[PDB]
A and B are shown apart, each in its own frame.
Chain A
Amino acid sequence: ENQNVNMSRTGSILKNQEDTFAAELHRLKQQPLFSLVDFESVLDRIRSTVAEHLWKLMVEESDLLGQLKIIKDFYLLGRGELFQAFIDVAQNMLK
Chain B
Amino acid sequence: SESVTCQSFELTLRSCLYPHIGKQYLECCGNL
- When C-beta atoms are compared, the residue in chain B nearest to A18 turns out to be B5
Contacts of B5 in A (CB 8 A): 19, 22, 25-26
Within the complex, the shortest CB–CB distance from A25 to chain B, in Å, comes to 7
CA gap between A75 and B5 in the complex, in Å: 49
A95 at interface, CB cutoff 8 A: no
Total number of B residues with any Cβ neighbor in A under 8 Å: 3
CA gap between A26 and B7 in the complex, in Å: 12
Contacts of A25 in B (CB 8 A): 4-5, 7
Within the complex, the shortest CB–CB distance from B11 to chain A, in Å, comes to 12
Within the complex, the shortest CB–CB distance from B12 to chain A, in Å, comes to 12
CA gap between A81 and B7 in the complex, in Å: 59
CA gap between A25 and B5 in the complex, in Å: 8
Contacts of B4 in A (CB 8 A): 22, 25-26, 29
A-B contact pairs, 5 of them (CB 8 A): A22-B4, A22-B5, A25-B4, A25-B5, A25-B7
Residue ranges of A at the interface with B (Cβ–Cβ < 8 Å) = 19, 22, 25-26, 29
Residue ranges of B at the interface with A (Cβ–Cβ < 8 Å) = 4-5, 7
A25-B4, A25-B5 known; 7 new pairs, CB 8 Å cut-off, are A19-B5, A22-B4, A22-B5, A25-B7, A26-B4, A26-B5, A29-B4
